[PDB]
Design brief:
Two copies of one chain form a homodimer. By secondary structure, the first copy, chain A, is α+β, with helices and mostly antiparallel strands. Chain A is 49% helix and 9% strand. The structure holds sodium ion. Chains A, B: Belongs to the GST superfamily. Mu family.
Chain lengths: 218, 218
């Protein structure tokens, strides 16, 4: 019965999924892949079973729940969310969820691109220069709402939390100009099932990225 | 009052949206922004309006429909699709829709990455070496189904059509090994409203990408 979540033994793209699985009290186990160390960074464990699990578009992370085999982190989150009415009910909520689902991936991928290239320190200045405007848009989108879709928490709160928390690790002061984002993080981490998970042995906040990353590899 | 689709005067990320608006007999008009040529690629036409349209995360394309102001092309597609029950009904359809919404963006962005890269000619051979396996995944996922979510067309058929068609422009023979994908294209282009639109003066198949592209800029 327990679902299987497959991913590298890192935080990465599985962080929001792990948090949502824990928030919804879902029964799951993790299939963990380990990347080899430098200089080769072997990925054989995944690449050689990548095509042996019945996934339609093999990729990490994946979720196996009975006959349902899902890839793409956002499709995984949506699947879990539908089981728990975490998807937005009003048309307004649904639009906000769809926008943020795609926007959070853009901003995550932009950080991933800066952290996997070797000129990271050469490219980091322009990134931090353009970062406050990115966070301001999140802060203004939230405004006075408790959650990003409106009055009710949805799966995109888990995506926005991950994006925000990644950046306060990346730059510790980046949220100081945005008190409503700091309060959002405080309220998210204070949710009973989330707080219990973050204080448990399963909590895997680091490394942020794979061994292949210039930043966040450890 | 027609909806407003705003984008560059190219095919780009708006193709699937244009096709879906046409299939659904939507009332819309297009706000076309023109981009300057190299090396500056002037976008001041967009920049002078970018923050004055009510968009939460200003970006192109956008869709304005009364009070609803939407960015992210997948969010735009979902908004139009919900008006016409084109998002999938059963859980099984919804999973396939969710996977494909994100998978098609992945493959779209992977072609965009090499076509916008200055070393395009250096990178093309390996991309073409890996292309058959990518398309095989779409062919095996479709199987003998008429549409990608199952027995009824959904908005992700428009997304898959665009990615496949982009690649037969890029590599004309690339679908030859996959008859069910060729048949799918025939079915998509054989929809009455798509057929009429493709013969219309509104059809805009080229340029594939923006003026900044190395491949597909004209
Ligand atoms: Na939808």
């Amino acid at each position: 019965m327990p679902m299987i979540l497959g991913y590298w033994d890192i935080r990465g793209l599985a962080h929001a999924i792990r948090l949502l699985l824990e928030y919804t009290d879902s029964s799951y186990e993790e299939k963990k892949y380990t990347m080899g160390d430098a200089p080769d960074y072997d990925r054989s464990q995944w690449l050689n079973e990548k095509f042996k699990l019945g996934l339609d578009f093999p990729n990490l992370p994946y979720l196996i729940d009975g006959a349902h085999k899902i890839t793409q982190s956002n499709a995984i989150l949506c699947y879990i969310a539908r089981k728990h009415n975490l998807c937005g009910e009003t048309e307004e909520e649904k639009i906000r969820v769809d926008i943020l689902e795609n926007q959070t991936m853009d901003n995550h991928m932009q950080l991933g691109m800066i952290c996997y290239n070797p000129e990271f320190e050469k490219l980091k200045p322009k990134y931090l220069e353009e970062l406050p405007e990115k966070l301001k848009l999140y802060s203004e989108f939230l405004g006075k709402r408790p959650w990003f879709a409106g009055n009710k928490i949805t799966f995109v709160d888990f995506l926005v939390y991950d994006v925000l928390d990644l950046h306060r690790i990346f730059e510790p002061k980046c949220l100081d100009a945005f008190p409503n984002l700091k309060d959002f993080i405080s309220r998210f981490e204070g949710l009973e099932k989330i707080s219990a998970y973050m204080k448990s042995s399963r909590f895997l906040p680091r490394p942020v990225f794979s061994k292949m990353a210039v930043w966040g590899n450890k």
